[PDB]
Amino acid sequence: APECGERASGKRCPNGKCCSQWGYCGTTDNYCGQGCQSQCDYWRCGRDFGGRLCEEDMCCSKYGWCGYSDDHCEDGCQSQCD
């Protein structure tokens, strides 16, 4: 029962999740890695990714990675740094 992708009339996953090669939504390698059809950038963010905001209040690092550490939230953080 496809949730996203070519097998689901081009539907995109809610909460920016990755659409796997099999048409399912997730945030792990099986969904965001090889074969991912859309929103494969769930863990990426900022200036090089359409100014996208991270889900679950994650900070966007200066290198465009979603996380909660000082490397993500302080020097150069792009969004949701608090």
Features:
mitogen; disulfide bond; Wheat Germ Agglutinin (Isolectin 2), domain 1; 82 residues; two-stranded antiparallel ribbon; elongated; little secondary structure; chitin-binding; Endochitinase-like_sf; Lectin-D2
Describe the structure.
By secondary structure, the protein is mostly loops. The protein has 2 domains: 1-40, Endochitinase-like (Wheat Germ Agglutinin (Isolectin 2), domain 1), CATH 3.30.60.10; 41-82, Endochitinase-like (Wheat Germ Agglutinin (Isolectin 2), domain 1), CATH 3.30.60. 10% of the residues lie in helices and 10% in strands. The protein has 2 helices and 4 strands, in the order E-E-H-E-E-H. The chain has helices at 29-32, 70-73; strands at residues 18-19, 25-26, 59-60, 66-67. The strands form 2 sheets. A two-stranded antiparallel ribbon has the order 1-2. It has a two-stranded antiparallel ribbon with strand order 3-4. The longest helix is centred in the middle third of the chain and has 4 residues, at 29-32. It is elongated, with a radius of gyration of 14 Å. The N and C termini lie far apart (39 Å). It is classed as sugar binding protein. The entry lists the keywords lectin, chitin-binding domain, sugar binding protein.
